[PDB]
């Protein structure tokens, strides 16, 4: 019953420079129940060795977690974060927008 849809932000740790190694972050917040499944993608393919921080929750009780992996931005490769949470009928995929 009690359910809250997660907010999702996908962004790099450092300013994006095509061809230069960086770290892609997928910050998921404001969700409940705590159980959640996160995946990060490069051209629609799961990226290996994606690291997940430990879960925590905010002052408003909603949970949050940070997923991140190494990546090198380019002109043609796409990067996204797909989230599966009981608050949604199907997994939500958010693409990385370097201007955000």
């Amino acid at each position: 019953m009690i359910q809250k849809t997660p907010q999702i932000q996908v962004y790099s740790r450092h300013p994006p420079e095509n061809g230069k190694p960086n770290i892609l972050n997928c910050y998921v917040t404001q969700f409940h129940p705590p159980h959640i499944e996160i995946q990060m993608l490069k051209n629609g393919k799961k990226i290996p060795k994606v690291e997940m921080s430990d879960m925590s929750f905010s002052k408003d009780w909603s949970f949050y977690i940070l997923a991140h992996t190494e990546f090198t931005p380019t002109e043609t490769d796409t990067y996204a974060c797909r989230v599966k949470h009981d608050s949604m009928a199907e997994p939500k995929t958010v693409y990385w927008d370097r201007d955000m």
Binding site: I2, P15, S56, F57, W61, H68
Partner: protein, 273 residues
């Protein structure tokens, strides 16, 4: 405005006896310790450098407490199932936030104790550390139960004693870490938006602490309601990020200015495209 807090979470696992239990402690919003029942060897662990100071007896003692807490949440979870007439074939959550705040004059400013069931407020200890505020009918049962048992006195004592003791301790040991700042590195970017209109985005990166304020101004007035502000996010290295943007008429970008206020900035920054 210093503070310490412990955010505990217990999640029932259908069919199983033991719920998963996670406890995270913070000092000035910085995670410094954590305990997770899911680990191969459940134990409170350092999550910040200056906690290396503590000896083994400290972790052992904290870990023992965690075991105690686990039992408490397990029984509480079960009781809550009955209050709401819920089936145990599903998962449920019981959360707790507790701690203390120090005012300007380093004295105790406020003590905190609140619980949430299924992510919603259940019951909370009032600022007087004597009375309880219940959120619904079920909680009222708990409230009446705790007034009769004098539970508040137990919490008040921790909140005004041990809580203050250690917060002072941690603030002293992590002083060089907690009292530091990393002022933001900011810049303005220009982006297409729609016909005759472009987007100006003001970024603040690598800053610490998280507290910050970004504003846009047009003709000396802040664009209070015509500005998009993303929520502060972790860079992943201990610092934070944030930005605020505005959609402006193409050919008038210059008329807009961004200001960045951070406690690491003695004077606020003033940027533009």
């Amino acid at each position: 405005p210093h503070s310490m807090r412990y955010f505990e979470t217990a999640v029932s696992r259908p069919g199983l006896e033991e719920p998963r239990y996670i406890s995270v402690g913070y000092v000035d919003n910085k995670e410094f310790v954590r305990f997770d029942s899911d680990a191969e060897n459940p134990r409170y662990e350092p999550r910040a450098p200056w906690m290396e100071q503590e000896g083994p007896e400290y972790w052992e003692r904290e870990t023992q407490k965690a075991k105690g807490q686990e039992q408490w949440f397990r029984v509480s979870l079960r009781n809550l199932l009955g209050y709401y007439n819920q089936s145990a074939g599903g998962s449920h959550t019981l959360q707790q936030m507790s701690g203390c705040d120090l005012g300007s004059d380093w004295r105790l400013l406020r003590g905190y104790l609140q619980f949430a069931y299924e992510g919603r407020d259940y019951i909370a200890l009032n600022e007087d550390l004597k009375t309880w505020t219940a959120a619904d009918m079920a909680a009222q049962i708990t409230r009446r139960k705790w007034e009769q048992s004098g539970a508040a006195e137990h919490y008040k004592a921790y909140l005004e004693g041990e809580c203050v003791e250690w917060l002072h301790r941690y603030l002293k040991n992590g002083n060089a870490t907690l009292l530091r700042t990393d002022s933001p590195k900011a810049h303005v970017t220009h982006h297409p938006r729609s016909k005759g209109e472009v987007t100006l985005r003001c970024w603040a990166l690598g800053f610490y602490p998280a507290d910050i304020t970004l504003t846009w101004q047009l003709n000396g007035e802040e664009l209070t309601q015509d500005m998009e502000l993303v929520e502060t996010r972790p860079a992943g290295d201990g610092t934070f990020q944030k930005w605020a943007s505005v959609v402006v008429p193409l050919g008038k970008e210059q008329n807009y200015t961004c200001r960045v206020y951070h406690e690491g900035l003695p004077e606020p920054l003033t940027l533009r495209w």
